[PDB]
C-alpha cells in the first residue's frame, strides 16, 4: 500500500486523424508533432487531431487498489479512451489533469489507452492568439498513479491534494493551515491523518487528527501547524524549505502518503520603494522564459529545464516570469530550489501588434478561463518561488471588452489564494491597468522605434500621475542574430532581415541604466532569456523565430548582452568578457573595444603590446577608444589586474576597403 507512480512515456502508436488508413508509427513522450513544421516557419502548421495509443497491462494484484492516469500537459484538448470507451475530456493546453480508471479496466490483461489530442484552433480555449507556437500533442509526462482505496485525493484539479496555506509568517513564528483532500472508496471507517514537518532528520512539527470517512467520501480536512523561529525561504540568499509528509494511518499501518515542500516567506510591494522579501528590499533582476527549445519544440526533457536554470543562475537572474502559461511542475521546483522569485500566469494572451483578439465574450470561453486559473493556483499552490499570479498579457478593450471579466478572474484568484498578489502585463493605457494588485508594461523603446530614453519618460510620468500603482516592466528587449555583425552602431528596422548583435547589446546597456536608477520599479523582466519559436515571424536571420533571446534557441551561444548582465548581476564570480568578438571584420579606422568585468579595471593588448589600463564604470564596463589596428590580422586581448589574471581574446581582420563611400 505504498503509493506507486509509474511513468507511461515509452512506445506509443501515433497517427493523425487526417491520415484515414489507420497505420501508425512509434513515438515516445514527451512529444509534439509541430517540432518540424512550426519551427521551419510554416505559418499554417498542423493544428488538429493526433492520436496516441498504448497497451497497458493491468496487474492482477492492483485489484483492490485505486488507479489514476495523470497527464502533466496535452495541447490543447485531450479526449481519453480506455478500451476505446470515452472516459473524459480536458480543455486547456498547460494544466495537468487526471481520470480515475479503477472501475474501467480489465484486471490481469492488456487494456488499450487511447489519447486523441487536438491543437486545432478554438474560440473557447485561451490562448486564442499569441507570438508563440501552439505545439500540439502529449508534450509532458503521463503517469499511472496507484493508491490505497482510502487516499489523499489526487482528484482536486489534478493537484497533489494538499494546500499548505501560509496564514502568518515572521521570523518569530509561522502559522500554516494544512488543507488535505481525502477520498474514500473502502467501507465506512475512521483513519488517522498525520502531517509531519521536517528539516533533514529533525522533526519540526507533528500533528494528527482522526477523521471519519463515509464510503464514497470526498472531503477537505484542515490541520493547523505552528513553527517557532522558522527558517524562511529567502530567495537566492537562502532558498530554504522544510519537507512535509502527509500520511493516512489505520491500525498501526501507514496506508497512503504524499510529500510537499514548505517554503515560508512573506513579501510586499511598495509603490515607491519596490519589492520586499521577508521585510528586506530586493531588486528583482528578471528575465522571461518560454517552454520550448530548438529541434524538440515544447517536448522538453528534464535536462532542458535544468540547463535553462543553470544558464539563468550563471547570469545572476533572481526573478523569472514564466510566460505565457502554466509551466512544468519541475520548472517551478527548480525555481524553489534556486531561490528565484517567480511570476506564474494563465494564458490569457492578447494580439500585440497582430490581428484578432485574446478575449471572446462567450460563456464557454469565460468558464474555461476560470478553470485554467483554478488549475494553475491549485496545482502549483505550494511552490514558495511563486510570488505573483499573472492574469493576462496585452489584452485590449476594443471590441469584446475583457475588463469586467478580468475583474472576475482577479476576485477568483484572491478567493483561491489570498496569500499572493495578482499581476498582469499590459501594452495599453486605461482601465485594464487598474485591476491587478501589481501592474507591469511590455516596453520596446529603442527597438520598435524611438530611443531607450522614452522608457525613462514613460516610467517617470506614469509613476507621477498614478502614485498608487506598483509599476513593473513585464517585457523589454531587442532582437539579435549572432550571425549579423557590423563594425558601426546603427539602429536596424525591427521587422527586417538584419538584426546586428551590437544593437541588442546597446539596447540592454541603455535600458538597464534607466531601470537601475528607478527603485520604484518593483521588477523588470527581459524579453527573453532565449530565442524562441514563433512560426509567423519573418525577421532576423531566419523565419519562424523571435530572436530577442540573450541566448540562442538551442541554448548553445550566449549573446554579448548575457555577459553585460552577468557582470552586473553575478558579482561574486570573477569574469572578463570582450564584447564584439563575433565581429571579425573591422573597417573603422578608429576602433573601440569594450569589456564587461567584475574587476575594477582591465588592460588591453593589441598584437601583444599593451594599450594600457582602463577603469570599469558603474556598470562593470571597460572601454578603450581610438585603438589603431594594422591592416590584416590583429590579436586583441584583455586581462584583469594581478599576477593571476583572467583573460579574453579574439583575432580580427582589419581591412581598409568597402560601396561608394
DSSP 158: T
Residue 4 engages its own copies in binding (rule: CB under 8 A): yes
Extended beta strands in 534-608, E state: 545-546, 576-578, 585-586, 591-597, 601-606
| Shorter beta-carbon distance to its own copies: residue 16 or 434 | 16
Closest of 657, 470, 648, 631 to residue 558, by C-alpha: 648
Tell me, by CB under 5 A, how many residues bind Cl ion: 6
As measured in angstroms, the least distance from the Cβ of 90 to Cl ion is: 23
Which 116-155 positions form the footprint of its own copies (CB under 8 A)?
Answer: 116, 118, 120-123, 129
C-alpha grid cell for residue 484? 549579423
What is the Cα 135 distance to its own chain's centre?
A: 16
Answer with the entry of its own copies, Cl ion, none that 271 interacts with (C-beta below 5 to 8 A by kind).
none
As measured in angstroms, the least distance from the Cβ of 585 to its own copies is: 7
Query: So which residues are the catalytic ones?
Result: 394
Half-sphere exposure of 72 (CA within 13 A, CB side): 21
Among the residue ranges 94-102, 288-296, 370-378, 512-520, the one whose residues contact its own copies (CB under 8 A): 288-296
Answer with the entry of its own copies, Cl ion, none that 395 interacts with (C-beta below 5 to 8 A by kind).
Cl ion
Residue 19 engages its own copies in binding (rule: CB under 8 A): yes
SS3 102: coil
Answer with the entry of Cl ion, its own copies, none that 358 interacts with (C-beta below 5 to 8 A by kind).
Cl ion
Answer with the entry of Cl ion, its own copies, none that 367 interacts with (C-beta below 5 to 8 A by kind).
none
As measured in angstroms, the least distance from the Cβ of 267 to its own copies is: 32
Inter-axis angle of helices 329-338 and 302-314, nearest 10:
30
Q: What distances in angstroms separate CA 532 from CA 289, 382, 495, 563, one per listed residue?
A: 9, 29, 16, 20
SS3 498: coil
Which 381-410 positions form the footprint of Cl ion (CB under 5 A)?
Answer: 395-396
Rounded Cα gap, residues 517 and 509, in angstroms:
13
As measured in angstroms, the least distance from the Cβ of 411 to Cl ion is: 20
Give yes or no for a contact between 278 and 18, defined as CB atoms under 8 angstroms apart.
no
Number of H helices, E strands in the chain: 7, 39
Beta strands across the sheet bearing 591-597? 576-578, 591-597, 621-627
Residue 658 engages its own copies in binding (rule: CB under 8 A): yes
DSSP 62: G
Residue 26 engages its own copies in binding (rule: CB under 8 A): yes
As measured in angstroms, the least distance from the Cβ of 47 to its own copies is: 6
Residue 356 engages its own copies in binding (rule: CB under 8 A): yes
| Shorter beta-carbon distance to its own copies: residue 437 or 541 | 541
| Shorter beta-carbon distance to its own copies: residue 133 or 385 | 133
Is 242 annotated for ligand binding?
no
Which member of 126, 282, 296, 480 binds its own copies (CB under 8 A)? 296
As measured in angstroms, the least distance from the Cβ of 141 to its own copies is: 11
Residue 130 engages Cl ion in binding (rule: CB under 5 A): no
Is 527 annotated for ligand binding?
yes
Which 339-368 positions form the footprint of Cl ion (CB under 5 A)?
Answer: 350, 357-359
Residue 369 engages Cl ion in binding (rule: CB under 5 A): no
Answer with the entry of its own copies, Cl ion, none that 15 interacts with (C-beta below 5 to 8 A by kind).
its own copies
Instruction: Give me the residues paired with residue 202 across strands.
Output: 199
| Shorter beta-carbon distance to its own copies: residue 20 or 609 | 20
> Computed over its alpha carbons, how large is the radius of gyration of the chain?
27
Is 528 annotated for ligand binding?
no
Closest of 157, 68, 601, 638 to residue 379, by C-alpha: 157
Give yes or no for a contact between 322 and 528, defined as CB atoms under 8 angstroms apart.
no
Which member of 301, 571, 615, 625 binds its own copies (CB under 8 A)? 301
Rounded Cα gap, residues 34 and 32, in angstroms:
5
Q: Which residues bind Cl ion (CB under 5 A)?
A: 350, 357-359, 395-396
Amino acid at each position: 500500500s505504498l503509493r506507486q507512480d509509474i511513468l507511461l512515456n515509452n512506445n506509443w502508436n501515433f497517427r493523425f486523424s487526417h491520415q484515414v488508413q489507420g497505420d501508425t508509427r512509434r513515438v515516445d513522450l514527451p512529444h509534439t508533432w509541430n517540432a518540424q513544421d512550426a519551427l521551419a516557419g510554416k505559418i499554417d502548421y498542423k493544428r488538429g487531431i493526433g492520436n496516441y495509443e498504448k497497451a497497458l497491462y493491468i496487474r492482477p494484484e492492483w485489484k483492490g487498489k485505486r488507479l489514476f492516469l495523470r497527464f502533466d500537459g496535452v495541447n490543447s484538448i485531450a479526449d481519453v479512451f480506455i478500451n476505446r470507451k470515452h472516459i473524459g475530456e480536458h480543455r486547456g493546453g498547460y494544466g495537468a489533469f487526471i481520470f480515475e480508471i479503477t472501475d474501467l479496466v480489465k484486471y490481469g490483461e492488456k487494456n488499450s489507452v487511447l489519447v486523441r489530442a487536438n491543437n486545432g484552433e478554438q474560440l473557447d480555449i485561451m490562448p486564442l492568439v499569441g507570438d508563440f507556437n501552439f505545439y500540439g500533442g502529449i508534450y509532458r509526462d503521463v503517469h499511472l498513479l496507484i493508491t490505497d482505496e482510502t487516499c489523499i485525493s489526487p482528484l482536486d484539479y489534478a493537484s497533489p491534494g494538499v494546500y499548505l496555506v501560509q496564514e502568518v509568517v515572521s521570523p518569530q513564528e509561522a502559522k500554516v493551515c494544512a488543507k488535505v483532500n481525502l477520498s474514500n472508496r473502502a467501507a465506512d471507517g475512521t483513519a488517522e491523518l498525520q502531517v509531519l514537518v521536517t528539516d533533514g532528520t529533525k522533526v519540526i512539527c507533528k500533528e494528527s487528527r482522526n477523521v471519519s470517512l463515509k464510503q464514497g467520501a470526498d472531503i477537505l480536512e484542515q490541520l493547523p501547524l505552528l513553527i517557532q523561529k522558522p527558517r524562511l525561504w529567502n530567495g537566492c540568499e537562502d532558498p530554504f524549505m522544510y519537507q512535509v509528509s502527509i500520511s493516512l494511518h489505520k491500525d498501526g499501518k501507514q496506508i497512503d502518503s504524499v510529500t510537499q515542500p514548505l517554503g515560508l516567506r512573506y513579501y510586499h510591494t511598495d509603490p515607491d520603494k519596490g519589492f520586499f522579501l521577508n521585510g528586506k528590499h530586493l531588486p528583482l533582476h528578471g528575465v522571461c522564459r518560454h517552454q520550448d527549445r530548438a529541434e524538440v519544440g515544447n517536448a522538453l526533457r528534464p535536462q532542458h529545464h535544468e540547463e535553462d536554470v543553470a544558464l539563468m543562475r550563471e547570469m545572476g537572474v533572481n526573478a523569472i516570469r514564466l510566460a505565457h502559461y502554466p509551466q512544468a511542475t519541475y520548472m517551478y521546483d527548480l525555481m524553489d530550489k534556486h531561490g528565484i522569485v517567480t511570476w506564474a500566469e494563465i494564458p490569457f494572451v492578447g494580439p500585440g501588434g497582430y490581428a484578432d483578439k485574446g478575449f471572446v465574450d462567450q460563456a464557454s470561453f469565460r468558464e474555461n478561463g476560470k478553470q485554467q486559473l483554478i488549475e494553475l493556483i491549485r496545482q502549483h499552490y505550494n511552490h514558495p518561488s511563486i510570488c505573483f499570479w499573472g492574469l493576462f498579457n496585452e489584452l485590449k478593450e476594443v471590441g469584446d471588452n475583457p475588463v469586467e471579466y478580468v475583474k472576475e478572474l482577479n476576485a477568483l484568484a484572491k478567493q483561491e489564494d489570498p496569500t499572493r498578489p495578482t499581476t498582469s502585463a499590459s501594452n495599453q493605457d486605461g482601465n485594464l491597468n487598474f485591476i491587478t494588485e501589481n501592474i507591469a508594461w511590455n516596453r520596446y523603446d529603442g527597438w520598435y522605434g524611438s530611443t531607450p530614453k522614452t522608457l525613462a519618460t514613460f516610467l517617470d510620468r506614469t509613476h507621477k500621475k498614478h502614485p498608487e500603482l506598483r509599476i513593473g516592466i513585464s517585457e523589454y528587449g531587442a532582437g539579435a542574430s549572432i550571425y549579423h555583425q557590423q563594425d558601426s552602431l546603427k539602429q536596424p528596422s525591427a521587422s527586417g532581415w538584419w538584426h546586428p548583435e551590437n544593437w541588442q547589446t546597446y539596447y540592454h546597456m541603455e535600458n538597464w541604466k534607466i531601470i537601475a536608477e528607478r527603485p520604484f520599479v518593483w521588477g523588470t523582466f527581459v524579453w527573453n532569456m532565449f530565442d524562441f519559436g514563433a512560426a509567423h515571424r519573418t525577421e532576423g536571420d531566419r523565419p519562424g523565430i523571435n530572436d530577442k533571446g540573450l541566448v540562442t534557441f538551442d541554448r548553445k551561444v550566449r549573446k554579448d548582452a548575457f555577459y553585460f548582465y552577468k557582470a552586473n548581476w553575478n558579482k561574486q564570480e570573477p569574469m572578463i568578457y570582450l564584447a564584439e568578438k563575433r565581429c571579425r571584420l573591422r573597417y573603422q579606422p578608429e576602433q573601440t573595444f569594450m569589456a564587461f568585468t567584475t574587476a575594477p579595471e582591465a588592460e588591453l593588448f593589441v598584437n601583444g603590446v599593451s594599450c594600457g589600463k582602463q577603469k570599469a564604470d558603474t556598470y562593470s564596463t571597460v572601454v578603450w577608444k581610438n585603438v589603431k589596428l594594422t591592416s590584416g590580422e590583429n590579436i586583441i586581448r584583455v586581462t584583469t589586474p594581478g599576477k593571476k589574471p583572467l583573460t579574453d581574446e579574439v583575432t580580427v581582420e582589419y581591412k581598409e576597403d568597402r560601396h561608394h563611400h
